[model samples]
Every structure is written in C-alpha cells, then in structure tokens.
Target: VKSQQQIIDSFKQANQDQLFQYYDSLTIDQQQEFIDQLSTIEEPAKLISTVEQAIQFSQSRNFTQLPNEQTASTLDLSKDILQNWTELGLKAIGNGEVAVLLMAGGQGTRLGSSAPKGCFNIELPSQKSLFQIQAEKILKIEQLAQQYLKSTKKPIINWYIMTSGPTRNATESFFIENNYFGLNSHQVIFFNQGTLPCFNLQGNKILLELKNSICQSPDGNGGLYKALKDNGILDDLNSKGIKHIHMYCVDNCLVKVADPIFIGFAIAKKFDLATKVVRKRDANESVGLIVLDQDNQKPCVIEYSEISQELANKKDPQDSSKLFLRAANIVNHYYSVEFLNKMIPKWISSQKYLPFHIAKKKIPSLNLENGEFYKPTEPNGIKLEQFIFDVFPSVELNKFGCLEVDRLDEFSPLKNADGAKNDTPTTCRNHYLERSSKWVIQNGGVIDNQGLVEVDSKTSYGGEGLEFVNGKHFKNGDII
Candidate 1:
C-alpha cells in the first residue's frame, strides 16, 4: 500500500486536489477514514483515464445495430429435453459441483423498505421473506438431487450471497435471526461487493458525500467479476469442489434457485457461460437482447435503446411468424468455475474487455466551502458502472449458450412500490400464485374457486411430486 503522503501527491498530480480541500479541518479519526477510502483507488492514473472515458461516453449517443446474421437462437424447453437436462444437472448436484450465487447488494428503497431487498416480504400466505423463499428452493433442489442419485451421502448446494456495504450487516443479521432459513450456516457464504467513486459532470472530479468521506456507490452487479477475484471467492468455490455457479439477482420472486434443468443444459452442452432468457413481449418492450456482436462475432447484450425501430421490428426471413431478436436477458446465468478462473484476470487488466458506462443522476453532495450537504433536484453528476452482461463478449461463440424460459413461470421481478403498474409487490405475488396454481393443474389437481392458491417451495419444485394432489381441490389462501 502507498503511504498517505504518496496518495495525496498522486491526487495532486492528477489535478484532483479539490477532493481534499477541507482535509485540514477534519478530526484525526476522520482523516484516517478518508485516507482508507482513497486507498481503494489502487491506480490513480487509471482512475483519471476512467473519468476521461466517462466524459467521452456521455457526449456520444451513437449506436450501431448488427445485421440479421448476428441474431442468436435460444434453446427451447420441451418435456423430453427438460427431462434429459434435469438428469444431467442432478448428477452434477449429486457430486457437489454446483453452487448458487445470489446478488443481494441492493437496498429495498424502491419497495418502500430500508432493509436489504432479500428481506422484503411480499405478503405471501407464509409471510416468508425473499431470502427464506430462496433458501427453501435450494433445500428442495438438494433433496431432489439426493433422491435421484440414490447415494447414502447427502448432496449440498452451497449458497454464496454477494452483499454491498450498506446491506451486508443487515442481511447477515437477518439470516442469523432466522437460523439461516434452515440452511447450515457453514454452507452460506457472505462477501461484500466493491464500490466506485462518483464524479462531477463538469470537470470529472470526485464528489464528497460528507465532510470526512467521499461519495461512492456499489459497482454495478457486473462488479461480481472483480469482487470474486479480489475476495478470493473463486478459490473458496474451487476448494469446495464447486464447478458451476448459478447467479441471479435478489428481486426476482419467481427465480428457480439452482435450477436443475438450466444447470443440466449447461453441463450437457459443456458451456463455459450460459444464460436463461425469456421471449420479448413485443417490438417496443424495454429489455436487453442477447446477440452476437457483428464486429467480433462474440456474444453480447444490446440494450433496447441502442436499436432503431426498424431493426427492432425486423422478423426472421425464414420464419415470418417469429421476431428475429426475441431473447430478452433476465439476469439469470450459469458460469463454469474454470471459465472464471481463466478470464477474470485478463478482463480486469484491460478496459477493452469490460468498459464502464456513464449514468447521470441526482447526487446528494457536500459543499466543501460551507460544509453544507445539499441534494440536487436535477442530474448533477455521473456514476460509472460495469454491467454483468459486458462479460458476454469475452466468451467464444460455441462456448456460450442461451436457454429460453416462459415469462410467467420465471421472470416476475419486484422493482417498484405496490401502486405501480408492473413489477410491484402485488404483481410479483400474483405471478407466483398463478404459476403455483398452473403447476397443480398440470399435475391433475383441481381448483375449487378463483381464489389464490399458494405452493411452498418445499412442497414442489417446478411441479414435481404432486401426484397426491391429483384429485384434491384447493381454494383461495390454500397453501400446498
């Protein structure tokens, strides 16, 4: 680590002395804390370059949409294929080669809660939080795999949760209070994600959130790549015999934790990286689509805003009934441990692999001259972030795979307050209920009324072992 004086000198050389304009007024403890935060900027030269890149990116909105040849197809989920893939996935699980990584670093401010998003309760019949529901799913998968393998030894799926500085403590306490939601404490690992400094839009200078601290935000979910290497998480996974990682965000209530079919598909095809996608609703739907980059012929995600209306509306020439680009990314992915071990180091060393994007936002900052904290009403600064999908381009075409899943069964995300039109608590709860009801109906069960029927993750995972409910009737508020 560099000495405090050297760090200050480097900042001065980069013309960022304004960051310490009020340093002389700070207390001893505050000064030490500020130095620790500044030390996180390992390379002052690279930091300056990043700010310059952000400035250039913000000034240009130009985007190029690739041709039809760049469009990629996803693996469809059929009954026969599902069985084959599920078996393969179960074998890996039985061997203890699979792990589930939950990205729960975000707070639930959007959902009207100050706690971590995983602690939010959607008012389900059981009143279980997102963390509990996900834990139960993992338990169910473990049981299913154990039964399939018929081994005396139990198969375990370790849960690795990635938390941010703000949510890490509360998340850990919540789990401890709940006895880790019935999971062995040793099996659940918690680690913090990295943070990046925020910069002013005008001169690319870092902003201060408080008199003693600089403003910083969680490096986007894409920070997983860096955090894994920095925290030695990859080494831990390898030591535990984990060969595959299933990663997803915390807000998706319908996510299938450690999904066997998804895992099995990746294993069967020997994919280095894989993703679970849903069919786009329409041409104008706002979601990212996974496609091959025209320049490199490598997999990459293209945002909805980047494509023109004409290209978005284009249909496949061979099949006029289907849209040429319909696979919408859902943030559900599978990554092989070997792939990460080989690529992450190289990706971290070069910006050509994963470049940061600029986000303009209203930042609450401290006025150094007067020591007054003010919240801006309009966008005053830019927050730089690296998207998880940015790593897609690093994988070769043949080694990458995409599996298309039904929207109703898999993609209900909780992102807004209850009163919002979509992705609210009500909508997510309703989707879960609807999917559970359908699973029962598929297994020859009957619905007594139009009332909601809930299914426990332990009772059934993807509608399996439900033959006993064939002739039974379920009404509203029924928990199966």
Candidate 2:
C-alpha cells in the first residue's frame, strides 16, 4: 500500500527530470498520481511555502547544554534546582487568571513508532501513555491549587494545547476516551498550528500523492502566534482574564504544573521571558548553548552547529572562578501573550525569505536516458523546513531570567526516531517516575527511597508512611 506521505504527495505532477531532482519516499503509483496533480495550473511556490512550514510551529532549541559536571555548583541540581515548590507553584497556578499552553505536536518516530510520542508507554512496563501521565500531574496540581486558592483573590489556571492537524485529532480522541483524566474537559482547549509546504530546491513542485499541495508539516512552534491569532483563541482567553501564559512541552513528566516558584520568580524579576536549563553533558552534545546574540544584543541559544570553543569557554565575571552559565533552553518558556501577538506578525512581514533544508527522500526512480525503471531506495532532494528558533532574534526582552533544573528527570527529550539518550519513551517515562518518587522521599513522605515506582490502581499508602530501603519501610505509594 502507498504510505500516507505517498498518498499526500501523489497529487502533484512530475517527469524524468523532476523524479531525478526530488525523489524521496514515494511509490510508483503514487508518483504517477503526483505527476497528474502537478499538471494543474496556478502557482506552485505558494503551495510549497504553505506546506513545508513545520519549523515555525514547533522546532525549538534544546536550551540546556552548558558545560562541566564537577568542580563547580552552577549545574548542581541541589544548589540551583527548585525547592519549596508546593508554596511557590500552588500560588502561581491559583493566580486566578493564568493559562498554560502545551506545545505537543510531535510523532513518536524517535520512540520507534509513528504514533503520538505522548502515547509512548514507558511507565515501568505499564502502558500508561505520556498524555495520561501529564494529565494526572495537571490534576494533582489543580487539587493542590484548590487547597491553596480557596482564600486567594486570584483565579486558578486554565489549560490549552497547540496541536498540529494530526496531533489535535489524537488529543481530542484520547482525552474524550479517557475522560480528560480529571482536569475538566472544559478547562482544556486544542488549536491548530499553521502548515507549510514542501518543494524542490528552487521552490518548484514534485509528486507525493495525487494532490497538487506541497507535502507540508507544522510550520514550527512560532506558529503558536498564528494559531492563537487566526483562531480567535486569545480573545476568548482574554475574556476569562488570562494575563500570563506558562508554556511547556508535551514530554517532561517531571514538569511542575504552573510551577509557582518559577512563575513568581519571573514576575518578581519582571522578566518578559524566563527559562530553565541544565548544564551540558559534554563539550559537544547537540544542544543550543545559551548566549547573548552579538548583533541583536539579546539572549538566545547557539545551536551546536553554530558554536565555537571560545564562547563555550567564556568565564563568568560575576565569579570568574565559577562558570556564570546556569539556564539552558529546555523549552520551558513563559511568554507574555500580548508580546507574542505583536511579535509573530511583525517578524513575518519583516523577513524577506525563510531558509529550508533540502533532503533526499525514498522514492522509486527511472533513468532519464533509458526507459528502464530503477528500484526504490534511491535518494532525491526535497525541501523541508526552518525551525522556530530562527525567530529567537526577534524577541525584545525588557527583562529575562534563567533558573537551573536537573537534567536526569526534567530534561530528557524524545528527539530522534526513538532509542537514544533522552529520546526513548521508556527512558523519558522512567526518568519522571524515579524523580517524582525522590521528591516524595525528600519531603517527609515515604518512597521506595531510591528506586523506580510501580503505581497501580490499588497502590495506596496510609498514615505517615515510611519509605523503604530494599523492603525496609513503605511510604507514599505501595509499589516501588
């Protein structure tokens, strides 16, 4: 059977030269269908630009990645990491009119499947999905907020999701089927990010399915602006009096819900943007190195491809004996919505052209000089997307702040097609459970103390429970 990508690409038109120039991931029947579609009239460049914009909707710099794990405390989780979160977080979450936006429009290809990465079941062999786990955390926060905000003058938080065409459908279905897992379906809203199109290097067309559309992807997380603007979501949210947005990724189970400490810190510091970071594992891990953009004079992450040893090795004048760096771009951002609305449209009208990557896709081929058909598995160059980070230069921060967090639990990412450090679903899930269990242990509660948690329906603990050490004492949850 022709793949969805093939079916989508089949609507365009192409010939020998076209196939030779841009071939990647299409079958013979799909190729012919695309050729037929390309036969249509009108401008192909617009379509290509329209569909290949996945970068604008969600591509972000993994803002963590500094340097040095020892001899200093800049990256130490104990020193820089958050404590007293119950008071700090519950206050911010219950701040009456706060809203949260989750950017979770990714596939689990990196986790070895094409399903929503949010659905990867890595909870200690149980099939609990990422979506399910995050939802539960949100619920727990809501409960805690209710306890704290009962007397507060401000309102609690409302939740929102900016999903892609594919991700939105899945989120709605999964939530309804699972009953929103207790956060109130009304509190959650799902919206679509804009899509960009695919094209040849020069912005010409080829076939993927039978339609004349560019094989588009989500523009990038930057499309969050358009999603809210075009969808009239901000107006509705404004009606509810939402003043600030606490944004986070779909992964990161250890993400504290509306982390009050972070929010309070941002507000107190008067920072327009506040981010969290963990030091880099090595000198060369592929992550955005936090730095001040020289020309623009603002903070941004220098991607691994863009950095050099000099900048990476710069010493902090505040305390030259220690590295000044702490915040890494872990994508945990708090954006002033009013600022974002103006930023996206202004930035778009300002840019003359956007950069895109040209890649070879899998496609059946034929020799232009001969009539013989070539088997599939050959590469043909095709246009992909530019990431949202490209817009980092546009942010004018009246103020900015960065905090440190641990990399082990709060920082793992599912970036590749599954199966690498920080990429696997199993790894991300286990990382979260273990970390949360540790939090419980440290705070006068019982845990397995130093192990993985095996939570189940019957997993209950009563009365000042004691944490165990190899079956010594039992605390919060029964199974560990």
Candidate 3:
C-alpha cells in the first residue's frame, strides 16, 4: 500500500500531476478510492515510458514489411494424416490433458446489446447464445473423446474463460445462471484480463473517466500471457494436469471448441505453438498472413495493411494457381502448457517480445481543470494493445506449426450489426445453417425443407455420429 503523499510525489515526478489536480478538494473516501485505483496501474516510470514510446511509434509510422519470402508450410485438412492426429488428440482429451481457453473480453456493443458478446443470441432455431453454442461443442468433444477411449468415467475438458473488466461480472453471472452451460462448475474458471490507462493523442497525459477514476481499456488479447501468470492460472493448469490449451476468440460462430483434429495435429507435429489459418479469398483480402520472418526464419504474421500491393498480388512460383502468401490468421491457436509456462514469464518481463500497438479513438473524458465532461467527435486519444500474435516470432522455428482449414467450415466471425455488409448477425446465422446443412448432405441426408436446417452440436460434432441422418429426409429448422 503506497502512502497518499508518496503516490502524489511519484505522479509529479513522472510529470502526471494533472491526475491529482483535484486531489486536495476530494473527500477522504474519494481520495482513498483514487489511490486504490492508482495502485492498480503500472508503475509511474513504466507508464511514462509507454506513453513516450506510443507517441514515437504513432508519429514514425514505420511498420515492418516482410520480404517476399516463400510461404510458410502448413498441414492441410484434406490430408489423410488427420485421422491419426484426431485419434491422438482424442486420447489426450480422454486423459484430461487438454483445456479450452475462451477469449471473451469483448462486449456486444457492435451488436446493439449491452451484454457480453458471448451472451448475444444469434437467433438460431435453438436461440442459443455464442457461449452456449461453444459450451455445447466442448461437451460434445468430451463425449467423443470418452467414446474413443472406451472410458466410462467422464473426461473433463476444463474451460478457462478470459473476460475483461467491463464484461467479467456479466459473463460470470450468465454462466452461473445457465448452470455453466451443462459443464461442472468446478471445471469452469473465469479470469479478468489486465487493463491499461488510455493516453491522450499527444501521449503525454492519461485520461480520467471520472474525478477519482482513470479511463482504461483491456490490454488486448496478448494480455493473456501476463494475466495467466498474474492470476495464477498457470499454476492452476499445472494442478489440473493439463498439458495443452486450445484458445480461440468468442466472435467466430463456426469455431470448433476443443477441436480434436487441431489438437492432435499440433501434438503429432510436436509443436509448442500452433495456429489454424484459412486461405485468403483473393489477393487483396484483408487478413493477416502467417509467414516465416525473413530475418529470423521464425513464424510471424504480416498484417494486410503492411504489405505492398505488388507483394500482396504475388503468386507462387511453383504453383501459379495459388497465391504465394495465402494462409490467413484466424486467431485460432493451440499452445502446449509447457510452452506457455516457459515463455509467458519471459515475454511479460520484456517488451521486446510483444510490443503494444496503438489505436486512436474518440474518448469521453473529464477535464480536471474545470471538472467538465467532454466527449470528442474525432479521435482524441490512443489505446495501447498487444496482439496475441505479436509473440509468434518468439517461438522456435521447428516448434511452430500452422494448419490450413476451410474458411466456410470454420471462420465466420460476428463483428457488426444487422445492417452491416459483412460479418453481421445475419451472415453468421446463415453460415451456421449452411454448415449444418452441408454436414447432413454429406451424410447422404436430403434437405426437402424450404427454410434453413439446423444441427445440434450435442447430436454431432464435426459431422460424425450422424449415421442416423444418412438417407433421411430433413425439413427446415430440423435439429438433426
């Protein structure tokens, strides 16, 4: 616990005295609350350096462009080796060595809802929220693994859900209210991601949400590394005898939670870090590409915005039919628990491994000088965030892997409202139904219905165990 005077002096030394301009006028309780909030922030020196670096980075705009190196190799889903990998993944799950990590820090603000994104109902026939859909997938995976192992005892795939400060309470409450979505309460764990104070566009001062509180936002998905260590989640994973983590964002409607094939593939390749990617639809598709960095020959993702138009349109020399850089990152990843435990501590200790990216935004803040609340019309401040993929370069070359999956089967993301052109609730719902309908058709079932057909994850995960649907006629809205 830092003394009030000591905290004030430290802020002054860091040239952040404006934060305390009203300190003397605040009530005793308000002052105590403000101090408590300050305690949660990073040290004054670290904060000052971060702001300085952010300012420098924003002004320079020196984004790194990768050389036109050959595309990184990836295991294709069409390969016959996937069967063996699936068995390996299922065996690991049966042994309770696998866990699922859900990154649900985002809210449904874009979806016109105040609830967490996971709690947004996508208007499916079952009316299940994203969280429920994902939970059911985990449940189905557990059953599949158990059946494969011929074990009567249940194999629990512990779920580690990462929520942000704004969504933590509501997320937890939703899970509890739904009885953990059929998962045992003990097997589901929730932890909050760290937050960083918002800085003005000048990057010299922090914004205040209120007289006694600082404006802050979640420190991006990369904050997972630090949060895992800080919240003792690594220790908890060890205690639970978990060896692997399947991590994915909650926005993807088609995400396969605890995907056995992906897990198996990563295990089979002996990879410490693995990611699932989809082929870019076209030369100018806006998505990150996973490629080996020319400088280090280690896996790294190059953002679409950073690449030149000529390089973006380049075709593979050997196979002119395909783009040279086509593996698009989808934020689906697999991590060995050992890798996380070993690398996270070191990464968190050094900014060289994972640097923060700046995002300029309109911020509603308080003016300490006059106690007036001001909401700017244009971008007024910057938010620093460290992306999860920023650590890709830290992994050993041979220990990193990328798996190419079909975009239609796996990568429909929900990011906008109904009126948006793409990634809207309508698109996600259609993708879900299209996928389910495809599964049924592939299993020799006929769709005679006029409307969309739906498949319950509980009935079949990844189109398996649907033998009953073979040669059967299905109507619209059928939960096969």
lDDT tens digits, residues 1-480, model 2?
A: 455454334434322244434434556776566554444422444544543453243232223222332112223434233344435556666765567888887676655767766776664545667677667656655655676668543344677887778867776887898888766778878887776543433344443322222244566665666577778777776787666678888866556556665666566555566667776645545666566654556556666666556545555666655444434567887666666656656654433223343444543333333524454454543445444455554555446556666576456665554456556655666665666565445545554445455443212111112343333455433453
How many pairs of residues in model 1 come into backbone collision? 0
Q: How many backbone clashes does candidate 3 have?
A: 0
Clashes of each: 0, 58, 0
Poorest 10 consecutive residues of model 3 by lDDT?
A: 60-69
Give the local distance difference test score of model 3: 0.85
Q: Name the weakest run of 10 consecutive residues (lDDT summed) in model 2.
A: 457-466
lDDT of 1: 0.84
How large is the C-alpha RMSD of every model relative to the true structure? 2.4, 8.0, 2.6
Pick the winner on lDDT between candidates 2 and 3: 3
| TM-scores of all candidate predictions against the true structure | 0.95, 0.72, 0.95
Candidate 3: give the clashing pairs: none
Task: Rank candidates by lDDT, best first.
Answer: 3, 1, 2
